[PDB]
Amino acid sequence: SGPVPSRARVYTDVNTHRPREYWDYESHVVEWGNQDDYQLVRKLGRGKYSEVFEAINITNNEKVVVKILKPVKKKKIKREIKILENLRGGPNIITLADIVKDPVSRTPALVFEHVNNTDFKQLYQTLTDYDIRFYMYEILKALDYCHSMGIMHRDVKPHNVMIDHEHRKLRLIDWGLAEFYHPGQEYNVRVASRYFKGPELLVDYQMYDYSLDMWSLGCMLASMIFRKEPFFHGHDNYDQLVRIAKVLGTEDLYDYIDKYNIELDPRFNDILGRHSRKRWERFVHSENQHLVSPEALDFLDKLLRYDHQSRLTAREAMEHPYFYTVVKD
Ligand SMILES: COc1ccc(N/C=C2\C(=O)CCc3c2oc2cc(Cl)c(O)c(Cl)c32)cc1
Asked: Is 40 in the pocket of ligand 1 (CB under 6 A)?
């Protein structure tokens, strides 16, 4: 018995055709720079795996961002480096400019191009309907690119999308959780932030794929067009699935786990309940209606599906009528 296996419906075998060196990140050799080329200006944030600094390339007085990785996992460090180099130059992928050995932490410090990002809590309150569509398309370009290169981001969220709104410039960042997709490979479900975890992670289904990112993007889209950040506001990983079930309904959830022969954590027995699927119009009100269109709701409905295999791919999403009004490059 056990769970039914699953395959990505696009870019399924891209890594198995590439040279081993492309995805065998453990055997990667880092090309080092000079750490005294950079002067740290101010710490921008600290996470479980890194500290991020605004810095200045003191050789050309250029602003950069330095991400000093914590020595928690070495395999994870080579993984993020290899993925950043594999994806370098792709549309709206953050550009890894240099790698140095930080003298204090004695760990790799990644040097990125600088983005004049505005905080997403402040920025999302200002976005028009057109802005949301425009930036959603820009995010899709990055996602389709990394998916086409055999890589899933696995941490899509507003905090990991840097936007220079004055210049309409967008970069997908924090590739510290990204992984190469290998068909049939079972992955760690402790990825992404709670509010953006796909149902596959919440039901402990490990054989997921690029479509995880498309659920996370749908969560971002819902928060933007309905102006509720986050949209699924679970208090823990279990309540997170309950929050989703109160919107998408429990019948489709059971159909999803039945299709893949998944058994829910019995902890859900007394908290999941029975919920009908809600029409998206329940979340429309006077304060967000100018951001809601039939095209937006159809697009959101095709992202926020329990069955990861049924979600729009990034490429399919860019074909959606929701983006007909956006002027393309
Ligand atoms: C508070 O005022 C400001 C102004 C600018 C910023 N800019 C942050 C970033 C960038 O400009 C480069 C990409 C990057 C940034 O933060 C990151 C974090 C991680 Cl974890 C990561 O992997 C990457 Cl690539 C980045 C942040 C705050």
From this structure: no
